[PDB]
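Ligand-bound model needed. chloride ion.
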Amino acid sequence: DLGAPQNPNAKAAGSRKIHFNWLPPSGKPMGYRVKYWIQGDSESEAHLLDSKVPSVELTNLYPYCDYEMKVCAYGAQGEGPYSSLVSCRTHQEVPSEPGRLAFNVVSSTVTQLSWAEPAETNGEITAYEVCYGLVNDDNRPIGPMKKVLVDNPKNRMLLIENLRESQPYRYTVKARNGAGWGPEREAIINLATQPKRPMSIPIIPDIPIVDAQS
Ligand SMILES: [Cl-]
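Prediction:
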């Protein structure tokens, strides 16, 4: 009789891969079948992976995601029983870019900047960082970018005042999670060419409003 594979054991091998191994059972196993799924899913949603050796690498997994898996051996009698179930979480990976930058332009020197959360957070987002700087026409920076420091970096909007009139700026936003910073979303805009709309600001502490010429 083919026994259950023994000491099933899984470890994350990145954000998108898990290595799962086990000890061969007694009884002339000819190979193994691994079933794996996202913790919470059903077993018609389970993936089935064959292997000829007592380990596999699971691939094309979701970052920062709990998986469940188990493995059986097969041989002359067919399939033996499955191992006990093991769980393992993939690593976080940096988020994707934030959503496209939205500018609500108030005046020739003031604009609100906002953005959607990254389509793939690949973890929990703990901060955004906004940078901005003067550019010419080739998106060529004129001097250094500035980075904005704020009390609550999880907010997805900023008010920027005292920008240089009739001058284009590049703005970037990136997001951070436990794995670090992802790619930036960039936009280049000159407030002079934008239609203006007034906005209301509550007179309260901690409004995230930044002076562009510190
Ligand atoms: Cl990976």
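The radius of gyration is 26 Å.
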